[PDB]
Design a protein around this ligand. Structure first.
Ligand SMILES: [Zn+2]
Length: 110
């Protein structure tokens, strides 16, 4: 409970940083999209760092009824992180959701 409430205020701080980021100065409905992405990201069982790891993905694909193998999950993450981290951070998740590049995880969400 306390873990999740402090998780979301950490995500809220990040959203507030995006609301002021000149990169997204274009985006229409930005406050709304960011709220929705925070709620979606909060649906994962995040790791000790508050990030989506192999475990978080596994649990999510299973809740959603979508079969993924070890390697497919590995690839779903490196695809979204461009291969520089083995976990998806909220920043990476938001940039994924806003970005025009397609991603298996982005397409799995919807
Ligand atoms: Zn604050």
């Amino acid at each position: 409970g306390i873990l999740k409430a402090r998780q979301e205020r950490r995500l809220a701080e990040i959203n507030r940083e995006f609301l002021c980021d000149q990169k997204y100065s274009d985006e229409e409905n930005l406050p709304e999209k960011l709220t929705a992405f925070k709620e979606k990201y909060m649906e994962f069982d995040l790791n000790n760092e508050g990030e989506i790891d192999l475990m978080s993905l596994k649990r999510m694909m299973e809740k959603l009824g979508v079969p993924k193998t070890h390697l497919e999950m590995k690839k779903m993450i490196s695809e979204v992180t461009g291969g520089v981290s083995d976990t998806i951070s909220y920043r990476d998740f938001v940039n994924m959701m806003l970005g025009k590049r397609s991603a298996v995880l982005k397409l799995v969400m919807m």
